[PDB]
Design a protein around this nucleic acid. Structure first.
Lengths: 204, 86, 78, 76
RNA sequence: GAAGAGUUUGAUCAUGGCUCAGAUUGAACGCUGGCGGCAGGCCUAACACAUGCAAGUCGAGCGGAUGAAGGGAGCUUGCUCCUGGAUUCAGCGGCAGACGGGUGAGUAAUGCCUAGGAAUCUGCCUGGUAGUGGGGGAUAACGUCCGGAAACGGGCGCUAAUACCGCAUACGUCCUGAGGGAGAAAGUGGGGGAUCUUCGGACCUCACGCUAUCAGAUGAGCCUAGGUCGGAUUAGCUAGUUGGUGGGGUAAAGGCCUACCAAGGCGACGAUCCGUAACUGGUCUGAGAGGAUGAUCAGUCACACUGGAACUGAGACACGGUCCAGACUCCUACGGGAGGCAGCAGUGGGGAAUAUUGGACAAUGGGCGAAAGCCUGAUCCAGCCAUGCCGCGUGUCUUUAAGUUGGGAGGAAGGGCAGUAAGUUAAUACCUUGCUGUUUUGACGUUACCAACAGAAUAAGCACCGGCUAACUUCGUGCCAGCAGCCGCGGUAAUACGAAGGGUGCAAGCGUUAAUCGGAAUUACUGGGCGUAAAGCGCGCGUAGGUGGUUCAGCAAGUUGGAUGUGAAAUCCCCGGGCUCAACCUGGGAACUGCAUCCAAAACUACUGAGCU
């Protein structure tokens, strides 16, 4: 998890990051028109390894993940047989931190990672409280039956067809309970990553 | 220090050693006299001398002061040279 | 001295046994003569309780090994 | 149960030493080297001269540094 | 399944070293700290050790100490003569103390590891085979005396046995192996109707014991081959050494011990001496080859202040045994005595540096026991320490952790008992035992874990920002003060040094000191060099050795395939199962490139033979 004020992290990349605070926009009042840092009124020399850094240091800043946690996820890519780049983002989509919002129970990942620690998101009739569970293809996803009249769960159901459907789940909005159908490939992702170029920041 | 579980076996060992020293020496003086018998070359007492010894070499072997095949060798060493007196 | 015996593997507050055939000249967890199958009293779904194979368990009873006290009433679970 | 070597010294009674040679590989160098092994063989009748070839058998030790007896003079 | 940069020069190229990215540990140190689970925690002084504890167990093996109760006699409920037997437990005796535990000092080779080999014992255990009869002498406790403040000594005198010694007896077992000779044991408790009587005993009957052997399991001992650390600025070493026999001896082969006979033995494939070190499964970096390496874990070894030595015992040359010697230390009432933490705590002392004078035998073991159980600093498990390895939390109006309260499994296998059935029984009379169903009871950690409650109240820090790391204004300071791994930076607008002001690395940790491998083709077998960079002796004769023209045939040592035993388990590698997830835990296999044996092969090599030029 990364904490603090988050308007300043929407400026380095250029992409919306799916990191916001309300329900209308992003980078529309927190003045995203420059390149921040110590002194960034001028650019220059935007090339390979520092870009391979800015690739992984974006992917780190979205998914609530630390380099204690994330470069152990490259360790399973070599434990995976073949096609290491998309098989990195497999476990980031079998991640439960993202798929609460990929369903849409919380406003963002910053409310998705939080409530599952506050004993909201069960897996299969058990009590799971980790933002690292690996959801199999074919469990239900339900909510504990005391956070149902939590009304900021109802402050997330407006962006289902507004942030666009994912077309990989089948959810019941009446129960506030979902079901993760299957694992994605590299067609179900946003096109702002470079999956076999995060790989190249391993030997240097 | 030491324990009275071991202080009891302080007496139980050395007193038992004293009984096992005599009975052990009661063996090997009988074998010496039936080697003195061969070294005197007189069969006429040598036959009567180790037939007094064989009831002692194995009777000690039977009660676990010595082992039973130490007896089996010395019953075969002395006989294999009394036969040589011929 | 030859004995079939429960022997602690596993973790602390996580018992796992091997049912070693030992000599009672060694420790519980070192120099076993034979491991026949295991035991697990924390057995939950999917974990088999005990892998007792009577193909070899006859042999040490046949060659003169003994249960300790509990090993007798694991064979009584049959 | 068959070890073969050529006779190199016979000037003692009932005892002979042979060079049981071999050629085996060096582990990290790959070149097959010879490794000479100089056993002691016990003769029951002392009929082996220097340059003879014999085979031997293992038993209980016949002396110190001797646990192998003579089987048969194979050739000369 | 393998990533390179920077740096010699005015520039280049080549040879060649330096410094750097990484991953690591048994970790320190400088900083700052919320929690859980599994882990790990003298790496130095095998330094010295106060204190408590680390192996006592048994009365159903035996003599002997003390008197629960109860029923009675007197005095009259105070008391003992008794009657009795509940109980304990210092002295004998069995077994254990040879295990668990710890440490790595010694050891360069028979220690370890891999393969094989026979000339041996093994208490308790398990299958049988044969047997428990009859005697005898002591001995402690106890009695007192002497010496001593005590500790303890040592004078006689009592008594026992599952303590000892003969005699009887011999299915094996040993000798001679003709014939023959030889030598064993112990009884105790739960019972029992007929005859002997004091159906206390005897006999009957199971239970624990006891013995003489065999086969096995389980340990433990020899012997051979292989390899196992650095040096030739260590080349000769060796006399009981190498064989031979006679004997002697070990549980067992063997110059192991011995006398005498002979002159052998070891070694340039590295002997001997010298320095160093437990070894291995493995571990760490690696594309692998390898290199480094032996902390937890498991096998073997080795040691117990230091050295020598046996004793008892199935098993020791015995860590909480004895003896002797040495060093040290301690109590003395000066007579005489005692001690050995590399056992768990703990203390100095050394050091960069490492923990509690904890809880209980409830689980697993053991050690005795007929059983009950009794002990165990082994263990199960707890404090202490970010020491790793995982998860987790510090808020985007939820309450997780934490804390309050209420709840709540699993660790328990069984023991007591009083029926119930069974099969040994001569008599399922009766004991003794295994079965069944019920009742009674026993958890060190006392909880994990579930569900309520108050409210963001209790949570972030570190290092850098000149380059090749795309984190990259100024202010103070002026070849000062300083920083830094390589270049370098500072000599007056400082992106290189000290703050502030911002970012960035990844997070209860971040960094730098140290060590290991790496990139390093920078010791190049894979996989390098030598005219001038470092490097051809100045060249010969030639010993071991390395390699060897040519053909048929043979051998099957190297080579090649399959077969079988292994290569322990662990670790690792995949598929899993579980902790709500990950570590961790295991199940299954994979792996273990190895070793000998076995058969099959004959192109090539050695060897063997006849040749060919």
């Amino acid at each position: 998890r990364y904490i603090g004020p988050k308007c300043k992290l929407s400026r380095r990349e250029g992409t919306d990051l799916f990191l916001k605070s309300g329900a209308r926009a992003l980078d529309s009042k927190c003045k995203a028109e420059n390149v921040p840092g110590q002194h960034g009124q001028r650019r220059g020399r935007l090339s390979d390894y520092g870009l391979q850094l800015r690739e992984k240091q974006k992917v780190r800043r979205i998914y609530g993940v630390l380099e204690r946690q994330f470069r152990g996820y490259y360790q399973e890519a070599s434990r995976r047989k073949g096609s290491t780049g998309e098989n990195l983002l497999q476990l980031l989509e079998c991640r439960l931190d993202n798929v609460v919002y990929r369903m849409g129970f919380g406003s963002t990942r910053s409310e998705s990672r939080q409530l599952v620690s506050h004993k909201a998101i069960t897996v299969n009739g058990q009590t799971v409280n980790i933002p690292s569970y690996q959801v199999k293809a074919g469990d239900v996803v339900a909510v504990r039956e005391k956070s149902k009249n939590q009304l900021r769960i109802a402050q997330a159901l407006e962006l289902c067809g507004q942030r666009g459907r994912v077309e990989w789940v089948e959810v019941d909005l009446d129960k506030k309970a979902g079901t993760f159908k299957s694992a994605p490939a590299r067609s179900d992702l946003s096109a702002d990553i470079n999956e076999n170029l995060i790989v190249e920041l391993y030997s240097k | 220090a030491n324990t009275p579980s071991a202080k009891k076996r302080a007496k139980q060992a050395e007193k038992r050693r004293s009984h096992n020293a005599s009975l052990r020496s009661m063996v090997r003086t009988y074998i010496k006299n039936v080697v003195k018998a061969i070294d005197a070359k007189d069969l006429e007492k040598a036959q009567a001398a180790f037939t007094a010894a064989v009831p002692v070499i194995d009777r000690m072997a039977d009660k676990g002061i010595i082992h039973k095949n130490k007896a089996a060798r010395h019953k075969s060493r002395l006989s294999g040279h009394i036969k040589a007196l011929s | 001295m030859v004995t079939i015996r429960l022997a602690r593997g596993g973790s602390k507050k996580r018992p796992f046994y091997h049912l070693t055939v030992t000599n009672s000249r060694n420790a519980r967890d070192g120099r076993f003569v034979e491991r026949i199958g295991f035991f697990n009293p924390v057995a939950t779904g999917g974990e088999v309780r005990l892998s007792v194979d009577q193909e070899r368990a006859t042999y040490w009873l046949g060659q003169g090994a003994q249960p300790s006290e509990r090993v007798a009433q694991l064979l009584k679970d049959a | 149960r068959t070890l073969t070597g050529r006779v190199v010294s016979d000037k003692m009674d009932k005892t002979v030493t042979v060079l049981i040679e071999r050629r085996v590989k060096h582990p990290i160098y790959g070149k097959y080297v010879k490794r000479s092994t100089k056993l002691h063989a016990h003769d029951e009748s002392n009929q082996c001269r220097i340059g003879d070839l014999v085979t031997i058998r293992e038993t209980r030790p016949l002396a110190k540094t001797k646990a192998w007896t003579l089987v048969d003079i194979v050739e000369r």
